[PDB]
Design a binder for this molecule. Sequence first.
Ligand SMILES: CC(C)=CCC/C(C)=C\CC/C(C)=C/CC/C(C)=C\CC/C(C)=C/CC/C(C)=C/CC/C(C)=C/CC/C(C)=C/CC/C(C)=C\CC1=C(C)C(=O)c2ccccc2C1=O
Ligand code: SF4
Ligand code: SF4
Ligand code: SF4
Lengths: 191, 165, 183, 220, 407, 41, 125
Amino acid sequence: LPSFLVYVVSMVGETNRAPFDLPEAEGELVGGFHTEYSSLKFAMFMLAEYVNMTTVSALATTMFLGGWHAPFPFNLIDGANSGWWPLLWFTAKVWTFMFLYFWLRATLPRLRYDQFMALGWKVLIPVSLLWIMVVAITRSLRQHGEGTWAAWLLTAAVVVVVALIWGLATSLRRRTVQPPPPQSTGAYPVP
Amino acid sequence: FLDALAGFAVTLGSMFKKPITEGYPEKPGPVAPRYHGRHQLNRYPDGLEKCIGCELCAWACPADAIYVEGADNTADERYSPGERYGRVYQINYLRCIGCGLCIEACPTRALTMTTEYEMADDNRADLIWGKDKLLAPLQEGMQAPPHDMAPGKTDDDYYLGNVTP
Amino acid sequence: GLEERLPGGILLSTVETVAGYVRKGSLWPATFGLACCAIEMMSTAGPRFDIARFGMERFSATPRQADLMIVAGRVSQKMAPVLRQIYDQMVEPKWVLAMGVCASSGGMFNNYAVVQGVDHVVPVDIYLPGCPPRPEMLLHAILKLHDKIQQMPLGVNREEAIREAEQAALAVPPTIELKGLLR
Amino acid sequence: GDEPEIIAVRRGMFGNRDTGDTSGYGRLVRPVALPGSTPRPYGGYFDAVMDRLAEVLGEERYAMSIERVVVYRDQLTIEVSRVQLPAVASVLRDDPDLRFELCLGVSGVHYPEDTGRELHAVYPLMSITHNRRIQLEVAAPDADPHIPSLYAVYPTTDWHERETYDFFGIIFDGHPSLTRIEMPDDWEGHPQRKDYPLGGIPVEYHGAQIPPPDQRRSYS
Amino acid sequence: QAGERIVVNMGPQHPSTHGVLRLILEIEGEIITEARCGIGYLHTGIEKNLEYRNWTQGVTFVTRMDYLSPFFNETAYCLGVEKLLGITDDIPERASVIRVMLMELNRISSHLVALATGGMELGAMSAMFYGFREREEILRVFESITGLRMNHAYIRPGGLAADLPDDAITQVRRLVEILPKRLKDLEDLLNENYIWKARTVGVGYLDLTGCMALGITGPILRSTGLPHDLRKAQPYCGYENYEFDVITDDRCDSYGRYIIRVKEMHESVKIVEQCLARLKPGPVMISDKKLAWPADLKLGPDGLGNSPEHIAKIMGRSMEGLIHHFKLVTEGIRVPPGQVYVAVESPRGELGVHMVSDGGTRPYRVHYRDPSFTNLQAVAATCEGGMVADAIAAVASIDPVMGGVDR
Amino acid sequence: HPTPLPNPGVYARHNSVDVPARLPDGSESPLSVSTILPHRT
Amino acid sequence: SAPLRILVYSDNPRTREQVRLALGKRIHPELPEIEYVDVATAPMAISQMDAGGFDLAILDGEATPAGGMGVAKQVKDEIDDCPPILVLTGRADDAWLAKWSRAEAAVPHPIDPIRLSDAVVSLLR
Ligand SMILES: CC(C)=CCC/C(C)=C\CC/C(C)=C/CC/C(C)=C\CC/C(C)=C/CC/C(C)=C/CC/C(C)=C/CC/C(C)=C/CC/C(C)=C\CC1=C(C)C(=O)c2ccccc2C1=O
Ligand code: SF4
Ligand code: SF4
Ligand code: SF4
């Protein structure tokens, strides 16, 4: 799950889609990169964006959602994972990811690209790097029979990560600020 | 805190609600009864035009969107009660701002504002609507405007409302 | 464009009708609201109406991707050069909808500061009364423009239509000479 | 001066600038006078504000600076003498008892018939601390439209001095850059001056046209 | 140095610049090093054109600057005209109550537009649609009351253009009932959203000292913690009779201003509920026939027009009534010579009106100190030093309406 | 300090940021155009 | 020797008549003969100037569907070596836009025959 979440965030970033949407940023850069482009050149930029969306959604389906394997309600059906049905399952999962894309676009404002980079380097990269070590240690331990240690370490690591990420989101990004002093211009008496 | 994700609930929930869009043009939405739509020149029940050509509507227009010229109601050709009628009446709808001061100005209720609003053209001139376009359609019991007043009636009777088809 | 080099006949007629159908849909407006009429365009996009139902949801921020320039507001003197620049920086085919009385003819503001009609600086395809025009009126004007686009000719038909429209327009008397019934 | 400020003289009944639609009514002569100096017991807090202003300013300086005091419709307008405007503005802003920290802008008005005082600039000042409001009125001749810019005292006057210069030509000397803000820098004339024509065009109609309202008759 | 600095026109034609605002930004990389504002791309000469139309025609002009606050413009104009006339105490209580109700619904509408356009400028695509849904409810109410969706000329010197329709009160009650629920949707999208806060919090900072120096007002000023509101200080239209709290915040940044607007919408809903309670049957226009607008609009099968009763009175029975109708409609009232300054609390701050009458039937000089015009002077302070993205948020927080800016 | 610095001059045929605004005396306003730009247009 | 060809663009036939009346077959006996090409629609004027062979274009700033100033700006931005453009302005305050149109000369309505003739001579000389 940690790797899945990091990959999801990072692919939404990769496809230049909201809430990242930074290269285009209609509200800030008019048309962003594809300004000065018209006709099928702009059309091909958008086509590339959507094909990349499909590619990353399919890759997410492959790695994390069992690829084309039938989901649980249909997994019990005989032959669901055979014939052409796997195509249906893969399409369904890809389109759930597309739905997630559209949902994010509808719901979230777009970040400042510096804020996105701060997210990537102060949260995503550290979280994924720690998760790799945690997964490696856990797998090595269970391979060597120390299952209880593996489970304890996994739970403790995820708890610590969710605590520290919350600290970053609320403590480092403190919701408090200092006051201000007066200057040349006369100022009214504050409440 | 799930509160920070509250927005996702709003959009998702609104997915399963029926869209609130009005179905214009096939099923146009209901405009307010008091809406300031197209001006309309009304007739008396006998068919005579109400517009006496006083130009008060044009007087009060802040955009000079009404041009009116009066003429005498000669006995041979009478269009409205009294001795004046609006011979030429044009509204430049590319200058009209729908303020409604014209209908407030009119002393005969000759000028009203219907709820009809659809208006557009590719030519500037075509939106200068003359008397022919603005006159209300001739209803049942109304005669052609060029006719004498109702028998045994006078302008005062028309204004007091004592006239019938 | 090679579509213009296509010879007349069923081929050119079908190209014209397909192009008209395609262009009436996806008629992306330019993100170019002015004055109070811009609020009415936004309302037209708002949920109560839906500009999107006509394929016009994408308000192209850049003029390059914009097909329709809904002026939608009063054009001040200082703004006319900017409006013309935006219109030029759009690419063919281009259409201009003079939304509101100010955009169409200067409206109530018959004075120095206003241009007295968008058409003074860019060709206007549809004039839309109102101050502002309620969103249904905007949709009506947009559908009228759709009808105009659908019948838009191409190539040799375009040239012949231009010549015929010229021949017709050369004869129409000016509005000042329509003295019907004036004393 | 002490008499009320005559801004225009209208001749003839019915507010008609022209000769008269009906004979015999054009002989009335009524000067249109804006209110003159108010008798000293100003109502409300105006009396206190003027007492404090006269205390902070020296009697000589107060006499030199305050040309008139007009309490009209329970609103206080200090007709301040030009040149002294920065001094009185500083006094009003800085003095603890006056403390008019918030200048709301600068409005230009033109009185072409007001000899030597054609151009007026109005400074609506508000003191949030004391919750008080006043206006300063500074008059400049059309021939010498210069006025001291209050930019040092009230920075907000920028874009208001610029706007009023654009629309009236009042030269707020000392302003960091008194460039046109509304009109193009290439524009000729100052639109809101009364002598500047409205610049409209006739409204077209089938067979006719209506000239702009400034050309047509009026009975102001 | 110069080699590392671009200068770019945020320009009139830009999604966040409301089409007619020209932010000229000197940027080092993407940090706004310097800011200038080309203004007047939406100038209209409304102030001069007013001078050639009588009173009660200038209402139609003033309502078309700051077009997002039409009722505030109209109320300021009419308060000024009445003050020159000296009839501010003669306005019927019903007229004042309706004026307050309409200004508060208009505040809700204007804040909705501000939040919608700000969210869209900041990528909150659904914010615009939800805000405009609520605004469309409010505009249905306005259309029913006045017959126009926008640029209403409903408030007239001495009262209102016409009395409320029978169903208007029920529609306004339905608003008071549903509007907070709908506003909950828009608040959920933005209020506590992490991205929204990150995008607005700490952006466009402007201390109280800056607000005073530049004469800023409205949500920008009250984001500094100063509870200054012309409705409480210098009350007008009988605002003194309503129990409402002046919304203020201490963040001094864009998020503080956004929260102030959100809370002002709820305060306006409370004030409208109070207006509904206080609303009583009675005249909506001064009783003085020498000044009262003579028209009496009513509906019929033909449409909206002068009521048949008024037509009968003026064309059949009353010679004095006919003369008064003719004169007050045509050339209008003549205001005694004078010079007045009247201020209201428009959604963007102190909307001031300096109005001068030379005794004639036309306003000698009408000038609007539109709060947007002064607020835009804060762009240099609120944008310089931040990124262009932060500049977008700061400008949206200023919430300028270029119609009121240029006029 | 010059609030927002004066906007660059807007002339017919010239409205770029390089153009200098016109002072009442007819001279170009130095503050109107950023110093980095070469005075021209 | 070549007849100077002048393009007269105006939706109003009376403005074209006035232009073609102030100017004649010869502006002066020292000048070459003048031939007039009347155009009522902006597309037609643009097509004509695309074909070139014009020595002067008179564009009515008051043209209804597409004003003359817009056409002047368009032609100077689209036709290389386009002829000098004379614009007819419907009001004094349009002068600013007349400058923006980059028209070599501007003549206010109503068209003074002598002023128009003098401007045309100055542009052709
Ligand atoms: C190439 C080829 C032939 C291939 C073969 C195969 C083939 C044919 C196709 C392959 C696939 C391809 C290429 C398909 C083509 C289509 C394609 C590539 C994509 C384009 C379509 C697309 C991207 C669609 C989705 C985009 C989308 C979701 C758009 C919606 C955006 C929205 C919601 C816009 C609404 C915004 C809005 C309300 C605008 C109004 C703003 C305006 C105009 C006013 C200005 C204005 C504003 C903004 C104020 O802030 C303001 C504030 C206060 C007072 C005044 C104002 C004011 O005046
Ligand atoms: S419509 Fe009414 S106001 Fe206008 S001329 Fe006719 S009667 Fe008079
Ligand atoms: S709606 Fe107003 S502007 Fe339009 S014609 Fe009537 S009075 Fe004139
Ligand atoms: S037509 Fe009316 S609403 Fe539209 S921009 Fe002009 S004045 Fe504003």
